[PDB]
Amino acid sequence: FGLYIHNDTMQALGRPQDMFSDTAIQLQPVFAQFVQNIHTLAPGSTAPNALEPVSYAFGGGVVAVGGKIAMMPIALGTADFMIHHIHAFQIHVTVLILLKGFLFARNSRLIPDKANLGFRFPCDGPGRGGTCQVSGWDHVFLGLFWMFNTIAIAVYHFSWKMQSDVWGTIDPDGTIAHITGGNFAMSANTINGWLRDYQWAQAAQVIQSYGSALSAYGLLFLGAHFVWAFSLMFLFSGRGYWQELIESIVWAHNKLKVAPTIQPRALSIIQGRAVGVAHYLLGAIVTIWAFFEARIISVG
Amino acid sequence: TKFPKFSQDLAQDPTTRRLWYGIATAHDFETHDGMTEENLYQKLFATHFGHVAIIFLWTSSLLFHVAWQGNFEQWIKDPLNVRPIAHAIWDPHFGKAAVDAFTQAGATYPVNIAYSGVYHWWYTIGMRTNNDLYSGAVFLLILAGVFLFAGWLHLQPKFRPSLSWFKSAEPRLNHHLAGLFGVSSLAWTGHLVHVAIPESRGQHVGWDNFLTTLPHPEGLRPFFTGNWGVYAANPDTANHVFGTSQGAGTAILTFLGGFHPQTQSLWLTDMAHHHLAIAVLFIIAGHMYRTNFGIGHSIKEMLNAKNFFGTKTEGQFNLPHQGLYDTINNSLHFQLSLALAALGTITSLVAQHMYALPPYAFMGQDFTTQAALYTHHQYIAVFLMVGAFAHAGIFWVRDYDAEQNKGNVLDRVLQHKEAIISHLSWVSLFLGFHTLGLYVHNDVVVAFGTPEKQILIEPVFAQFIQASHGKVLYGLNTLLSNPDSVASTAGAAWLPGWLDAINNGTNSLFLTIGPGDFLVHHAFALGIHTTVLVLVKGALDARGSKLMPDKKDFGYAFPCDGPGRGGTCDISAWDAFYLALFWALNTVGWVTFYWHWKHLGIWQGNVAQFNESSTYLMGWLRDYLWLYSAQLINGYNPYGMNNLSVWAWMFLFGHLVWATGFMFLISWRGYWQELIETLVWAHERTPLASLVRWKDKPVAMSIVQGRLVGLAHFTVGYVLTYAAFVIASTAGKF
Amino acid sequence: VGAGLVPCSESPEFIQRAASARNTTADPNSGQKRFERYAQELCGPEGLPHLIVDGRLNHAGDFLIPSILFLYIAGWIGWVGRAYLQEIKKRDNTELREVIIDVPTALPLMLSGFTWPLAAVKELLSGELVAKDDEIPVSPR
Amino acid sequence: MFSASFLPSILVPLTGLVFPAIAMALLLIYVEREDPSGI
Amino acid sequence: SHSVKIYDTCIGCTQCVRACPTDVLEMVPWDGCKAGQIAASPRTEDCVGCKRCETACPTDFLSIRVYLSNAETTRSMGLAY
Amino acid sequence: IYRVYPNGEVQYLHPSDGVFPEKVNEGRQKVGYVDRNIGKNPDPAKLKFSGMTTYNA
Amino acid sequence: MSISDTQVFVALVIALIPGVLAFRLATELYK
Ligand SMILES: CC1=C(C/C=C(\C)CCC[C@H](C)CCC[C@H](C)CCCC(C)C)C(=O)c2ccccc2C1=O
Ligand code: SF4
Ligand code: SF4
């Protein structure tokens, strides 16, 4: 990531020769290229009783039908490097959190009663400073946040590549006129480009994609942000505040003789954490599926 | 015992948190070990001195720098177009097009643009040349130094004021409210009629010629005869040009009112007469109380009046007031809170009396400057008030005695706080529910293709007050729209020009409104309502709660009270402060964007977009969010650069620290310590690096410090991006 | 009804929209009809009508009677809820039935909310609606 | 440039770099001082 | 380390003394109620801040409290390193 | 259970009551007492210009 | 117009009056 932001700064600093793509400082994933190659010429010798390669993204001819691509070989240049490496990065940290909760489940260097006490409990008092969030399923909380990040950027990458240099239209010459125009070799190297050259395309119609017969489905993307902020509200706040507000409303209701017999009590902090993370995930995934659903409708 | 000396306790702990806590108390004096009152009073005296000294240094800084490498005179020649100069630019890491996109105004070095706007105000005061402000810097510098020395002197034993000398109020009262600004506004008025008005009329009056030439040819005649209309001689003509004499005038104190047809600002003679008015008014207000001499009003005993005209009283307005007037002299948090609240209120008012009453020349045409100033001052204002409420809260724990106020008005407030907070929650819930319901009404109805099935309100109370001030646009013929009513022969004695101005609503003078303004104004109401809600809740819980009454002795401090019932986190009397800060930030964002959209539509007159897409929120996030950013977003890109790359960097930097804030806020201190254990385990057992050891044994952060740093990151992230956006947009769209 | 607002009858853009006014529902007269129903109000440059709220008989009924209807129904529901709650407590099965609704008793209470306003007025004059500041023992502080 | 001398060329680094350096060095050695004296 | 605070509501069930894993309590002879021996803190210096003790106090407005101080050390912070 | 100093010397904190019953003895130690309710609590403005705690009335 | 060595002058007025005056006003409060 610091390498990435380094190149970001260089581009913003009129020092373009310090970029990292083919037109600048070099790095090339030779291993993937060589494995794909040794996959290209497989039949005949490794596969005698076999006619065509297993796929056509490794090698072979660009297979298609109509003015519509079916499969062409995929190109791995420079931008592949850091993308795969940050994939590995996030997977590593995810394993870190989960395995950490795994090993340090029964006994920590400070808490020798964990398994002696349970695995679903909020904290162990303000001893040793703080100890809140020392169970295991909070470890998996953090882990699920991280895997959200992982899979989100993974689907970003997949969609953008397979709409940038794999899919589009075709001419009688087999001329593949892709949808976007090969934008990775151009902008998928700096951060500001990543917001520009992805979500400009991913939303420029959803603003106006409503307003006729086969458009009226005003999508709940406008709607999901609300649930997202309402989500994050639950995270940052404690509970005693809500308990006291509840007690005041109870005072009023009791003054007007409408006191509910079953005495309301505020949520438990683990309950609140759970509902917060649930609403967070829901809003985010709703947002993103709305995004690319409408985006495909704009081409399909 | 060396660090920290001001607390013998905190220097007895081998954990890095010492340092963290070492620099979060050095400005909390009355918590240091062993210092009674007069020590604190005298050193506060000295430290306040130092504060105003560094203020003077700051002023000298900006003024000397603009005197050095600026284009103030090149701004004199072509005012309405030439752009000011901030200072020089020097960084080896810099780009390429930077020097290529900076050198303007005839300059050859990398000039930096200026936006605060000292040129207009200064020329309004009547400056002409670099040497003027050169000498200005040179002398207020020595002023600052002398003031510093003055601060030093009273530290010596024979120059130590008395605690009684601090408690005695009425002398400070009179000396300030009469002799601090009354006489000072008099002196400013003298500088106006002696220097400012001449320079406005084109005549140069230096530091020597002022001794022999006159303000007015009729001068000194009404001095002691009483025909003051003589000084109200021929006013300036309908074609006068500042700094020139084309159609000049020879009137000193006028009451023209409205605007000047060239600078579209306040008239300078109106300013002088104004200042004179308030000066003499404060002077007559000066002798209003009782001094050490034997006449006047004894404050601490005026309201000690419980009898008049037989029917004695319960106090003034018939309410108890006995026993609290010592508190304002006992506590300091009380006075501090009052001052903070007052200051914030009048700052907001200032921020409001700028975009309609241009005080200086060229103010209205230059959009970016006034816009930045407006949002700047309002932002300054918002949490300025939060300071007042927070210090009110901390006063409630430290500075408060029970029996001394038994049964007075304060206790009668505390006895019924309940209904207050309940009804406040009520009105907040009501307004929120209904405004959101009307919004979503609009959203779904327009989401079907038929907009006529959707509600449009129309405000008329502001319309009535608008016409009733004297607006004719709506033709209601009431109160200066009725030119024949009883009050239709009153107001200003120069109301014709004011009427020409206000009828000419072409400028920013009480523009028409519609349904949207109804909506957003109710939104403001809601915002401040919940803000004051959480603040007063924290304040009135500064003592204790129903399910935790003890906290009065726990202090304005951490208390967490571990999981008694489901948990009791965030109960510590300024937990409320964080929440209030969020609730203030979003409010001020709402209001400043409303102002921005209003004036943006006013710029090119195309008000259609605002009124057309103010109802449903899709229109809000579609018409103004991204429809102004491509003018900024491509400041740098794989193809070229501009003079905005630094501003895109502003954007992204702010976003980064913003998310960092989330990181600090969510994760808590029960996980960031297990791995520090194993990470200490490393150094102990690797070779070739186990040589070095620990200055101090490192541990994880603290809880309150974690909250504080998270909030700081969030607020700094919020500040930057919005500023960059607003100034870039204003300077890129005009 | 001022503020520079043209009547929705003679606002040209109003009828301009009315011409191709998208007939919403399954009946061809849907759109046009509603535009015909929108001649009583007064439009503006936006071509869409604003609502005036003054008791002024130009638009009085267009806001008053809906308000009063809401007051009716809100009074009914609040009244029947409070009455049900008061009733439950005279059973000594309080929180057992707090989740199990006693339908044969919950019905007539709902059905008997016909004259809530004036009856409530009576409980006001009789003072049958509030308990005493100190009798209510819910401790503050 | 203008009528001033080289000064804006090189007077930033020492204020930018070396003065912070001595500042923090002196500060650190201050926060470890013995008892009961300290400068 | 931190400070401990005792009251009169100690019924004498002695669930706190069996809960504190830090040996900071003992039932010194009393006379008032049927307890005859009321809890107290003789060995504060090993206080930990876990406050599992009052969670074991059944008395209405639990009889023990802990005023969580500011003079922490390697003992009060509880480090094995 | 034995605590040990850096010098190699040992402390005998516990067991001090045999099986750690923590409530049985014929007379016990006596250092420090506070047998008082909370309704009358220490106050900021009344207890001042010194550094004592919430106990001395 | 603009200035000359007189700016070295205005630099020279500093570092004795404001400089050590502020230095003393700082060191008064016992580091
Ligand atoms: C990250 C994190 C930590 C860990 C934070 C730590 C350990 C502090 C970070 C170490 C320092 C601040 C890093 C900075 C070091 C600098 C590079 C050194 C400065 C020297 C230069 C000036 C030369 C907590 O302790 C914590 C506690 C409670 C809630 C949330 C959190 C939390 O989110
Ligand atoms: S504090 Fe609780 S456990 Fe201890 S003696 Fe009293 S009642 Fe028993
Ligand atoms: S935290 Fe509670 S249980 Fe632990 S030593 Fe302190 S008082 Fe005893």
Coordinates of C-alpha atoms in Angstrom, one line a residue, chain G:
Chain G
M1 CA 8.7 50.9 -3.3
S2 CA 10.2 47.7 -1.9
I3 CA 13.0 47.5 0.6
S4 CA 16.7 46.8 1.2
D5 CA 19.1 45.9 4.0
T6 CA 16.5 47.7 6.1
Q7 CA 14.9 44.3 6.3
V8 CA 18.1 43.0 7.9
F9 CA 17.4 45.9 10.2
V10 CA 13.9 45.0 11.1
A11 CA 15.3 41.5 11.8
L12 CA 17.9 43.1 14.1
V13 CA 15.2 44.8 16.2
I14 CA 14.1 41.3 17.2
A15 CA 16.2 38.8 19.1
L16 CA 17.0 41.2 21.9
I17 CA 13.8 43.0 22.9
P18 CA 11.1 40.4 21.9
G19 CA 13.5 37.4 22.0
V20 CA 14.9 37.4 25.5
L21 CA 11.8 39.2 26.8
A22 CA 9.7 36.2 25.8
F23 CA 12.5 34.0 27.0
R24 CA 12.2 35.4 30.5
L25 CA 8.4 35.4 30.4
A26 CA 8.8 31.7 29.6
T27 CA 11.4 30.6 32.1
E28 CA 9.7 32.4 34.9
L29 CA 7.4 29.4 35.6
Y30 CA 10.1 26.9 36.6
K31 CA 10.5 24.3 33.8

